């Protein structure tokens, strides 16, 4: 024969129950049977992005052939899974490939249409060394084969819409991703399957949270394959933690260590201590065996329940009379209620932990994938949001108003009250140059997701040309950066949960504001390569200096409201009404006071003492030296980077020179005493 040599008889497998009873998908099975009951062009192809269960649609079609939900044009049909890889890979020679394939077509035509041929990965058939299309073509035209394809949409439009004859030989059935609730229903059927295998239980809140958080976060793989990945991987982690016991291992190491100690000593007391620890070890071991026996009985009774369900389906196919009522009314409710009695018994007895996969397990598995704070406000990030003013003032002294505004913005977003097409929050930082624009940016990226490195800083001062705009969106096809990628859009597509930091957007060309109009309108910024860039998870922050002299000269005896309205008017003179129209909340910075400069110096002393204690020195400072640093590092035009370069040039250059001179000794208290113009270090 040929058919047993190359194909996989799926109806025999579904008759042996080795498949998945996939719930739903009723319209796609209907449209596949609409195609398969035609006269010519009997060839549906199942098209969708991978993971959506096109193989499962074919297997569910086979299960409906076996049970008999099909019309009277498919009953008794066999479904055979041709393996396109299993015909190419023997052909060394001229015409041994076509030998096999003509053998397959003669045996299927001997069956006389009684065999629905199934071909998975149909885009292997076309380019496989003329080969396989130009023999199947006279059979696919006359309907004497019954091919069912299964392919990704990209391989469809690449390997078939090219070759138009084999395009019209087939027929599309567009398969869409399932919904969230359909994903939940699918996973409920698959829970009822999977708890036979991993010997555990699954609580349906973990199922719905798994589906929702997988749809929220995993943006490469698609439903339901990613949800099944999460559920199965958590089931395997719990199958580990059945036999992971740690306390028995600690007690065994303790008793063998005290055994070696007592055997070396042969005052004693250790016969008594070892007897107590052996008694505790035996009790924990017997409790462990009791838990194992409980889980074994629960698994066996769950397996007998599922075999009873399979047997009552056997009675639904065959048609025994008393067997139906007997199996149902006896076997289903009593086995379910003592399955729940075993469930509450395991809830009583599992001290040595879980057999029920909770949502925290899903959080641990998805955190091992990516690392998001996946779950909700867990009173650690939530109290962080309740002290988000304090959390931002942990690193950024001063500028209370913008801290409050950004805190309110993220408090709106994490509660789900943002308009979910816009990005998380637009910001127009104003005011004096170099106070903590970038420090608030770093602190925001820090206490948003990870750290200061989950950002993209873009100097907008460099973009002053038309081809600069074509750079930062991406060059259109047939041109240059279309080879070598866009600028902004690639930086977003690498870091999808990030912060975009612009720098002096007023120094940019007067048209990049229109790209920002698209950004702050809807957060899709279609690049040069024609694929969308999704800003709905990010935070766009823009910095400027359009009223730095205006704010520094009028901060005295003017409140926050008049300052905001005045700088709104001035920015309206500079910018356009559309651009400031799309902004969520323009904040206004104020100039710095000398106590804030002293606080910046304090934080620099904190980080410098940390670095030099990692180096190995114990250094103290007089506050007079702090006052000299504060007076030598502020100006109305530059701000606190004068303090930074003053700290660098007056500490980091001379004191490290004194260290490298073999002068200073690690461990000594090093008081940074003052000079007339400098700071001297002593060894005391």
Ligand X SMILES: Nc1ncnc2c1ncn2[C@@H]1O[C@H](COP(=O)(O)OP(=O)(O)O)[C@@H](O)[C@H]1O
Residues engaged in binding ligand X (CB under 6 A): 20, 22-25, 50-56, 120, 186, 190, 224-225, 228, 396-399, 433-439, 543, 600, 603, 639-641, 644
Shorter beta-carbon distance to ligand X: residue 336 or 549: 549
Report 254-313 residues binding its own copies (CB under 8 A): 263, 292
Answer with the entry of ligand X, its own copies, ligand AGS, none that 322 interacts with (C-beta below 5 to 8 A by kind): none
Q: Of 503, 522, 384, whose CA–CA distance to 441 is shortest?
A: 503
How many CA atoms does the CB half-sphere of 375 hold within 13 Å? 16
List 217, 369, 449, 482, residue binding its own copies (CB under 8 A)? 482
By CB under 8 A, residue 143 contacts its own copies: yes
Backbone angles phi, psi at 578, to 5 degrees: -70, -45
Answer with the entry of ligand AGS, ligand X, its own copies, none that 38 interacts with (C-beta below 5 to 8 A by kind): its own copies
Shorter beta-carbon distance to ligand X: residue 149 or 639: 639
Report 417-446 residues binding its own copies (CB under 8 A): 417-419
CA–CA distance, 407 with 447 (Å, rounded to integer): 11
Shortest Å distance, C-beta 170 to ligand AGS: 12
Answer with the entry of ligand X, ligand AGS, its own copies, none that 529 interacts with (C-beta below 5 to 8 A by kind): its own copies
Q: Which two tokens stand for residue 259?
A: 């055994």
Report 380-419 residues binding its own copies (CB under 8 A): 412, 415, 417-419
Nearest 5°: the CA angle 58, 197, 203 is: 95
The single residue listed with the structure tokens 């910018």 is: 575
Shortest Å distance, C-beta 130 to its own copies: 4
List 214, 470, 604, 650, residue binding its own copies (CB under 8 A)? 470
Shortest Å distance, C-beta 77 to ligand X: 20
Q: Which two tokens stand for residue 600?
A: 């910046």
Coil vs helix vs strand at 266: coil
Check: CB of residue 32 under 8 Å from CB of residue 148. yes
By CB under 8 A, residue 490 contacts its own copies: yes
By CB under 8 A, residue 160 contacts its own copies: no
Burial class of residue 325 (count of CB atoms within 10 Å of its CB; 0-12, 13-18, 19+)? exposed
Q: Render the burial of 602-639: b for 16+ CB within 10 Å, e for the rest.
A: eebbeebeeebeeeebebebeeebbebbbeebbeeeeb
By CB under 8 A, residue 529 contacts its own copies: yes
Q: Which two tokens stand for residue 513?
A: 């504001």
In the DSSP assignment, the letter for residue 678 is: S
By CB under 8 A, residue 130 contacts its own copies: yes
Backbone angles phi, psi at 589, to 5 degrees: -90, 155
CA–CA distance, 424 with 584 (Å, rounded to integer): 9
Shorter beta-carbon distance to its own copies: residue 266 or 267: 266
How many residues touch its own copies under the rule CB under 8 A: the total is: 96
Measured from each CB, the residue nearest to ligand AGS is 53
Shorter beta-carbon distance to its own copies: residue 7 or 537: 7
Answer with the entry of ligand X, its own copies, ligand AGS, none that 477 interacts with (C-beta below 5 to 8 A by kind): its own copies
DSSP states of 330-381 as a string? IIHHHHHHHHHHHHHHHHHH-----SEE-HHHHHHHHHHHT----SS--SSH
DSSP states of 27-51 as a string? HHHHHHHHHHTSSS---EEEE-STT
Answer with the entry of its own copies, ligand X, ligand AGS, none that 412 interacts with (C-beta below 5 to 8 A by kind): its own copies
Shorter beta-carbon distance to ligand X: residue 438 or 650: 438
The single residue listed with the structure tokens 């909340």 is: 585
Shorter beta-carbon distance to its own copies: residue 178 or 224: 224
Report 315-334 residues binding its own copies (CB under 8 A): 325
Task: Name the one range near its own copies by CB under 8 A: 175-183, 334-342, 399-407, 460-468.
Answer: 460-468
Shortest Å distance, C-beta 121 to ligand AGS: 7
Shortest Å distance, C-beta 197 to its own copies: 5
By CB under 8 A, residue 451 contacts its own copies: no
List 2, 12, 56, 133, residue binding its own copies (CB under 8 A)? 133
Residues found near ligand AGS in the complex (CB under 6 A) = 20, 22-25, 40, 50-56, 152, 164, 168, 186, 190, 224-225, 228
By CB under 8 A, residue 67 contacts its own copies: no
Sheet holding 455-459, edge to edge: 455-459, 499-503, 539-543, 426-429, 585-586
CA–CA distance, 270 with 260 (Å, rounded to integer): 11
In DSSP terms, 82 is beta-bridged to 119
DSSP states of 537-600 as a string? T-EEEEE--TTHHHHHHH-TT--HHHHHHHHHHHHHHHS-HHHHHS-SEE-------HHHHHHH
Task: Name the one range near its own copies by CB under 8 A: 128-136, 201-209, 347-355, 388-396.
Answer: 128-136
Shorter beta-carbon distance to its own copies: residue 387 or 467: 467
By CB under 8 A, residue 103 contacts its own copies: no
């Amino acid at each position: 024969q040929a058919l047993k040599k190359y194909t996989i008889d799926l109806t025999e497998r579904a008759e042996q129950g080795k498949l998945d009873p996939v719930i739903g998908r009723d319209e796609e099975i209907r449209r596949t049977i609409q195609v398969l009951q035609r006269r010519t062009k009997n060839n549906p192809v199942l098209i969708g992005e991978p993971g959506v269960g096109k193989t499962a649609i074919v297997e569910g079609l086979a299960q409906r052939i076996i049970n008999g939900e099909v019309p009277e044009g498919l009953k008794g049909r066999r479904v055979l899974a041709l393996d396109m890889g299993a015909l190419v890979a023997g052909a060394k020679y001229r015409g041994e490939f076509e030998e096999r394939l003509k053998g397959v077509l003669n045996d299927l035509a001997k069956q006389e249409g009684n065999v629905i041929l199934f071909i998975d990965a149909l885009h292997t058939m076309v380019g496989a060394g003329m080969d396989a299309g130009n023999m199947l073509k006279p059979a696919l035209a006359r309907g004497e084969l019954h091919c069912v394809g299964a392919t990704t949409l990209d391989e469809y439009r690449q390997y078939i819409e090219k070759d138009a004859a084999l395009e019209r030989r087939f027929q599309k059935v567009f398969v869409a991703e399932p919904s969230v609730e359909d994903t939940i229903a699918i996973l409920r059927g698959l829970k009822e399957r999977y708890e036979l295998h991993h010997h555990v239980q699954i609580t349906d809140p973990a199922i719905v949270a798994a589906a929702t958080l997988s749809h929220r976060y995993i943006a490469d793989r698609q439903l339901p394959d990613k949800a099944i990945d999460l559920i199965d991987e958590a089931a395997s982690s719990i199958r580990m933690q059945i036999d992971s016991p740690e306390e028995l291992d600690r007690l065994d190491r303790r008793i063998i260590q005290l055994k070696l100690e007592q055997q070396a000593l042969m005052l004693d007391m250790l016969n008594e201590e070892l007897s107590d620890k052996e008694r505790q070890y035996s009790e924990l071991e017997e409790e462990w065996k009791a838990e194992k026996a409980s889980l074994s009985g629960t698994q066996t009774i769950k397996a007998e329940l599922e075999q009873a369900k399979i047997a009552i389906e056997q009675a639904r196919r065959v048609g025994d009379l008393a067997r139906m009522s007997e199996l149902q009314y006896g076997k289903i409710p009593e086995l379910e209620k003592q399955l729940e009695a075993a469930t509450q018994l395991e809830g009583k007895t599992m001290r040595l932990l879980r057999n029920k996969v909770t949502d925290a397990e899903i959080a641990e598995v998805l955190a091992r994938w990516t690392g998001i704070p996946v779950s909700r406000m867990m009173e650690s990030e939530r109290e962080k949001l309740l002290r988000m003013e304090q959390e931002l003032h942990h690193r950024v002294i001063g500028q209370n108003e913008a801290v409050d505004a950004v805190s309110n913005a993220i408090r709106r977003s994490r509660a789900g009250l943002a308009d979910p097409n816009r990005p998380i929050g637009s910001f127009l930082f104003l005011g004096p140059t170099g106070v903590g624009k970038t420090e608030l940016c770093k602190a925001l990226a820090n206490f948003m997701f990870d750290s200061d490195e989950a950002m993209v800083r873009i100097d907008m001062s460099e973009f002053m040309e038309k081809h600069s705009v074509s750079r930062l969106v991406g060059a259109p096809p047939g041109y240059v950066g279309y080879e070598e990628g866009g600028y902004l859009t690639e930086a977003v597509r690498r870091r999808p949960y990030s912060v975009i930091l612009l720098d002096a957007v007023e120094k940019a060309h007067p048209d990049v504001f229109n790209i920002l109009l698209q950004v702050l309108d809807d957060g899709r910024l279609t690049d040069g390569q024609g694929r969308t860039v999704d800003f709905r998870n990010t935070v766009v922050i823009m910095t400027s200096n359009l009223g730095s002299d205006l704010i520094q000269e009028r901060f005295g005896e003017l409140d926050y409201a008049h300052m905001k309205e005045l700088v709104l008017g001035v920015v309206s003179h500079n910018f356009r009404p559309e651009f400031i129209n799309r902004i969520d909340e323009v904040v206004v910075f104020h100039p710095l006071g000398e106590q804030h400069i002293a606080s910046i110096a304090q934080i620099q002393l904190k980080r410098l003492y940390k670095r030099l204690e990692e180096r190995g020195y114990e250094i103290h400072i007089s506050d007079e030296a702090l006052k000299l640093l504060s007076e030598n590092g502020y100006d109305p035009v530059y701000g606190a980077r004068p303090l930074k370069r003053a700290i660098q040039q007056q500490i980091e250059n001379p004191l490290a020179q004194q260290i490298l001179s073999g002068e200073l000794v690690p461990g000594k208290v090093i008081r940074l005493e003052v000079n007339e113009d400098r700071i001297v270090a002593v060894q005391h």
